[PDB]
Design a protein around this ligand. Structure first.
Ligand SMILES: [Mg+2]
Ligand SMILES: [Mg+2]
Ligand SMILES: [Mg+2]
Ligand SMILES: [Mg+2]
Ligand SMILES: [Mg+2]
Ligand SMILES: [Mg+2]
Ligand SMILES: [Mg+2]
Ligand SMILES: [Mg+2]
Ligand SMILES: [Mg+2]
Ligand SMILES: [Mg+2]
Ligand SMILES: [Mg+2]
Ligand SMILES: [Mg+2]
Ligand SMILES: [Mg+2]
Ligand SMILES: [Mg+2]
Ligand SMILES: [Mg+2]
Ligand SMILES: [Mg+2]
Ligand SMILES: [Mg+2]
Ligand SMILES: [Mg+2]
Ligand SMILES: [Mg+2]
Ligand SMILES: [Mg+2]
Ligand SMILES: [Mg+2]
Ligand SMILES: [Mg+2]
Ligand SMILES: [Mg+2]
Ligand SMILES: [Mg+2]
Ligand SMILES: [Mg+2]
Ligand SMILES: [Mg+2]
Ligand SMILES: [Mg+2]
Ligand SMILES: [Mg+2]
Ligand SMILES: [Mg+2]
Ligand SMILES: [Mg+2]
Ligand SMILES: [Mg+2]
Ligand SMILES: [Mg+2]
Ligand SMILES: [Mg+2]
Ligand SMILES: [Mg+2]
Ligand SMILES: [Mg+2]
Ligand SMILES: [Mg+2]
Ligand SMILES: [Mg+2]
Ligand SMILES: [Mg+2]
Ligand SMILES: [Mg+2]
Ligand SMILES: [Mg+2]
Ligand SMILES: [Mg+2]
Ligand SMILES: [Mg+2]
Ligand SMILES: [Mg+2]
Ligand SMILES: [Mg+2]
Ligand SMILES: [Mg+2]
Ligand SMILES: [Mg+2]
Ligand SMILES: [Mg+2]
Ligand SMILES: [Mg+2]
Ligand SMILES: [Mg+2]
Ligand SMILES: [Mg+2]
Ligand SMILES: [Mg+2]
Ligand SMILES: [Mg+2]
Ligand SMILES: [Mg+2]
Ligand SMILES: [Mg+2]
Ligand SMILES: [Mg+2]
Ligand SMILES: [Mg+2]
Ligand SMILES: [Mg+2]
Ligand SMILES: [Mg+2]
Ligand SMILES: [Mg+2]
Ligand SMILES: [Mg+2]
Ligand SMILES: [Mg+2]
Ligand SMILES: [Mg+2]
Ligand SMILES: [Mg+2]
Ligand SMILES: [Mg+2]
Ligand SMILES: [Mg+2]
Ligand SMILES: [Mg+2]
Ligand SMILES: [Mg+2]
Ligand SMILES: [Mg+2]
Ligand SMILES: [Mg+2]
Lengths: 271, 94, 46, 22
RNA sequence: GCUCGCCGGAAGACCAAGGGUUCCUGUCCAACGUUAAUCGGGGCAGGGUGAGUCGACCCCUAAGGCGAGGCCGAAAGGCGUAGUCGAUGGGAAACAGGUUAAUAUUCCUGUACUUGGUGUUACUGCGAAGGGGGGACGGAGAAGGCUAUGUUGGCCGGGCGACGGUUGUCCCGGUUUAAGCGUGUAGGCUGGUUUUCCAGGCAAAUCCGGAAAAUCAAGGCUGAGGCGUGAUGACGAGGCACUACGGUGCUGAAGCAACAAAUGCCCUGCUUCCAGGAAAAGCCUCUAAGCAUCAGGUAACAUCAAAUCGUACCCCAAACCGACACAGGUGGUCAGGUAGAGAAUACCAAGGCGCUUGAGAGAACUCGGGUGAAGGAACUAGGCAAAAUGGUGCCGUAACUUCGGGAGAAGGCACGCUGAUAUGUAGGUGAGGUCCCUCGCGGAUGGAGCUGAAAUCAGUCGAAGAUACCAGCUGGCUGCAACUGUUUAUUAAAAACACAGCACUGUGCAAACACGAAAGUGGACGUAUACGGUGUGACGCCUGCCCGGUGCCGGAAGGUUAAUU
RNA sequence: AGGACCGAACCGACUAAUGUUGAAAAAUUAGCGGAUGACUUGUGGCUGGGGGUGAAAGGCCAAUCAAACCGGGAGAUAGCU
């Protein structure tokens, strides 16, 4: 669980690891691995397009199903594995006809149970079935947006999203940020939350884990020189202008969502 | 098989030296000076059908020439491949 | 101190060499200038 | 023989800001 | 040529990226060397690199680059698909001795190995731009067996020691021998084998993967090292001789054992932690488009072949970069004895160099240095400098706290040498001999020899026993930032910055935002427990009042108003 | 186990003298800190100037930087020398 460590040093005073001991060591099951190194935010055109990204450890992109294409057939899980890319834990699964895929772990998936991807699915945490057939009030993660594109909704390590009602061929989704989004009936879905829900309890502890995770030291504003950021300088500590981004837009509450495109799906934003 | 027209151009001269005057007797080897486009085919077929003698195996290198200064202006002598040609047991040149 | 220039021909002759200045556009606007004076050491091939 | 005639070192403007008169 | 200095994890040897005759002899002294010059990295003339195995080229890919098409852009161009490029990494090979004034794993005797087409010998499922297993991988510590080397003894050869001893428990020197081929090793890995099946691996698969059923105690994989064989050869202390007294030719015994031992091997292993640790090819293997009793296929062997280029020389330097033969700057490979924990440091070997101006006298003064009567910070901005402390074993050790530290707190004592406990034990290694054995590189087993600290007690010596080198100044009361870190190369390491933790706000994923006019590209092959922006900086207690100015958020009855009209 | 300690090579540049037409256009000597990590490093690919990169100093982008350097309009212009 949330294992604490002890003050053996400067620095190591505020660390707490999260150990799920069911996760096996050894090797990841090799024929669903490939290579995706990091460009440190540098795009193809050579500049920096997202800041503070650079450094970290070499990671391998596990091919993850987000589709559950093999409907109807049953399967059993094999193992639970530590994912390198997303914060969640992945489940190495066994299809009955012989393949192996990787499904994001529902919070009840101990090492040994079974999952039935299909329209004929049971209502158990781990299944997958389109959204005509979820009974409402349920807790559904791994939600798509279009009929077969891939899940992009509630895919993080601790999330879950509610289905709240229905109207016709539209079903109403209360997301984790609390934005009611109408969506089509065919978009793929699951049951239950996701597994490593205590991931938000884990704190980093030292600068070492920030560099290991990949995030560089973000430079704060008011000490930078006044050519290279508009929070500039001043001999002393002076700030008294409006708080802005590096490109002139002020930040604290100013909307910069700049669409009139997906208005006809979004019911109401949050508070 | 290398044609005779290409074969007849591949040599300039044998090469007098102290290591030639040791490799002649104490190991029975000869010291050519061939053209720069010569491979071990173009000397293994070239010691044979030009003295009507035989050969064991051939070796070469690419000597790079020195830097001379005639007057006060620099000068670069032409490079030239030096070939070592070992002769078989029971062989003796003219 | 480590000086202004620590040589490495394996990159010098591909970041300054003749085919490098022939691959781009304006390298053919430097090779189109060195012949006006007529440089006998045309570029940095040895 | 012969020889050249050197010149024109990077003479560092011959001074720091030594004469601090303020 | 002899002393004498000095380095010896360098100032030694071989190579790297680099340089382009500096290497070697024959000369030559004008200029070049912060001098003279026979000498020189200087001129001048000649001589000097050898390969199926080392490396490059080449077979294959990473980051990227190029990139027909295509998409996009005033045009050039810009990314980008298939591809084809791209080492610093992945894939064939081999070594030991001799040689010249110079090269040589390349030349020579010696003996090995691979990879390609060939012709035949019997064997007759090859077939692939496709399918799978592999290559294939992080960090830390921890052992286990081991050698490169090191020491000692046994042996062999020489010598009886310029001055008191020195035919003895004495002294010197030497004791080396490889890949390859069989040996399957201490150990590490993993349950194998057919019977039939199967929504799968793009299609088919006899290959994987899965479902069983029968059935066995055991199948291989993986490997360092030691023994064998390589081995009558080579070297080999040195004697045997003449010649160009420089050399060389001709001979040649011993070649054993034990212990010590890595930062080198197994190890690309094991354990275990989280930040979760490349691809593709060579290879292993299965199949279709294709097949014909053909072709191809490995089972043989006689072969035939296996290029081209790099190879000299210096390589932490007088040969590279720094304009100079400049206290400068750069990476990888090997570590010898002796006290020590040790690649530090000290003195040494093998090898190297003794620093391109030298002699003379011993002024002020400058620099680098040793010691000092007495006083101890009186000096001065300030103990800056210097001095002093310094090593293990054991005793001993505060307020204060986040319980970890403070702390090595403070301060102490012990220590050199000889003998005895024990003629060198406690500890390890371990052959004699039985012993049984699935007989082998096996153990049950036993102690020869070998090495081996500290301890204690006695004695003695020194002014001084961790004696040199080496090797923490410590407490007291404070601000400041929590800290480890990092920055103004070339005056500023700080109170700066950055950090983890927090707070807000933006962002529903074609995100949000940024670079590019666009194409796309990052974000992210991620999905609100995620990302971006800003604010302050661990935790501990805490984060009060005000929305008038100012911005931002929503709200739209009215006033207010463009383009149009 | 450790951004743990003491201390080598390696880095790093804090203190002091020397050296400042020095040996060196930033270094020697003697003391110093980090020294299994946010390290250091070999070689190679990427980032273009109102741009990059930056633990952000207005520091660095070939000894030059509050807009590098190389040609050009350049015979810019200078009411000042
Ligand atoms: Mg940031
Ligand atoms: Mg932050
Ligand atoms: Mg501005
Ligand atoms: Mg102020
Ligand atoms: Mg370039
Ligand atoms: Mg000495
Ligand atoms: Mg040297
Ligand atoms: Mg020369
Ligand atoms: Mg010479
Ligand atoms: Mg002279
Ligand atoms: Mg003279
Ligand atoms: Mg000479
Ligand atoms: Mg010379
Ligand atoms: Mg050759
Ligand atoms: Mg040969
Ligand atoms: Mg590419
Ligand atoms: Mg391109
Ligand atoms: Mg085109
Ligand atoms: Mg290629
Ligand atoms: Mg390479
Ligand atoms: Mg390679
Ligand atoms: Mg090879
Ligand atoms: Mg030599
Ligand atoms: Mg395959
Ligand atoms: Mg490792
Ligand atoms: Mg040994
Ligand atoms: Mg030995
Ligand atoms: Mg005597
Ligand atoms: Mg006597
Ligand atoms: Mg052997
Ligand atoms: Mg050599
Ligand atoms: Mg030097
Ligand atoms: Mg200079
Ligand atoms: Mg030593
Ligand atoms: Mg030393
Ligand atoms: Mg000198
Ligand atoms: Mg004096
Ligand atoms: Mg003194
Ligand atoms: Mg005295
Ligand atoms: Mg005194
Ligand atoms: Mg006194
Ligand atoms: Mg005073
Ligand atoms: Mg006074
Ligand atoms: Mg005072
Ligand atoms: Mg002091
Ligand atoms: Mg001192
Ligand atoms: Mg104060
Ligand atoms: Mg500080
Ligand atoms: Mg503060
Ligand atoms: Mg520090
Ligand atoms: Mg820095
Ligand atoms: Mg400074
Ligand atoms: Mg910061
Ligand atoms: Mg601050
Ligand atoms: Mg208001
Ligand atoms: Mg306001
Ligand atoms: Mg408003
Ligand atoms: Mg620094
Ligand atoms: Mg400083
Ligand atoms: Mg120093
Ligand atoms: Mg240290
Ligand atoms: Mg440390
Ligand atoms: Mg600043
Ligand atoms: Mg400033
Ligand atoms: Mg600069
Ligand atoms: Mg500019
Ligand atoms: Mg400008
Ligand atoms: Mg003009
Ligand atoms: Mg003018």
């Amino acid at each position: 669980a949330v294992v604490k460590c002890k003050p053996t040093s400067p620095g190591r005073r505020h660390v707490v690891k999260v150990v799920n001991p069911e996760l096996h060591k050894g090797k990841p099951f090799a024929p669903l691995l490939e290579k995706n190194s990091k460009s440190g935010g540098r795009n193809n055109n050579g500049r920096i397009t997202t800041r503070h990204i650079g450094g970290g450890h070499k990671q391998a992109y596990r091919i993850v199903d987000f589709k559950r294409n093999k409907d109807g057939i049953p399967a059993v899980v094999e193992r639970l594995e530590y994912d390198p890319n997303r914060s969640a834990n992945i489940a190495l699964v066994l299809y009955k006809d012989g393949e192996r895929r990787y499904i994001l772990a529902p919070k009840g998936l101990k090492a040994g149970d079974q999952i039935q991807s299909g329209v004929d699915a049971a209502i158990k945490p781990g299944n997958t079935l389109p959204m005509r057939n979820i009974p409402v009030g349920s807790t559904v993660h791994n939600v798509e947006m279009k009929p077969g594109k891939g899940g992009q909704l509630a895919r993080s390590a601790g999330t879950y999203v509610q289905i709240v009602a229905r109207d016709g061929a539209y079903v109403t989704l209360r997301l984790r940020s609390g934005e009611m989004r109408k969506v089509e009936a065919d978009c793929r879905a699951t049951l239950g939350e996701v597994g490593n829900a205590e991931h938000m309890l884990r704190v980093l502890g030292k600068a070492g884990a920030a560099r290991w995770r990949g995030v560089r030291p973000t430079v704060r504003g008011t000490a930078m020189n006044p050519v290279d950021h508009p929070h500039g300088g001043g001999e002393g500590r002076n700030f008294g202008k409006h708080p802005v981004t590096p490109w002139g837009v002020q930040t604290k509450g100013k909307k910069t969502r700049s669409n009139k495109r997906t208005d006809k799906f979004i019911v109401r934003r949050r508070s | 098989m290398i044609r005779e027209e290409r074969l007849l151009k591949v040599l300039r001269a044998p090469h007098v030296s102290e290591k030639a005057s040791t490799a002649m007797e104490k190991s029975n080897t000869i010291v050519l000076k061939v053209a720069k486009d010569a491979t071990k085919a173009e000397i293994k077929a070239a010691v044979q059908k030009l003295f009507e003698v035989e050969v064991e195996v051939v070796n070469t290198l690419v000597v790079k020439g020195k830097v001379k200064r005639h007057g006060q202006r620099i000068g670069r002598r032409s490079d030239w491949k030096k070939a070592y040609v070992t002769l078989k047991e029971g062989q003796n040149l003219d | 101190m480590k000086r202004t220039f620590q040589p490495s021909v394996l990159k010098r002759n591909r970041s300054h060499g003749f085919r490098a200045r022939m691959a781009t556009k304006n390298g053919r606007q430097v090779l189109a200038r060195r012949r006006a004076k007529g440089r006998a050491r045309l570029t940095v091939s040895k | 023989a012969a020889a050249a005639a050197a010149a024109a070192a990077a003479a560092a403007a011959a001074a720091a800001a030594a004469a601090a008169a303020a």
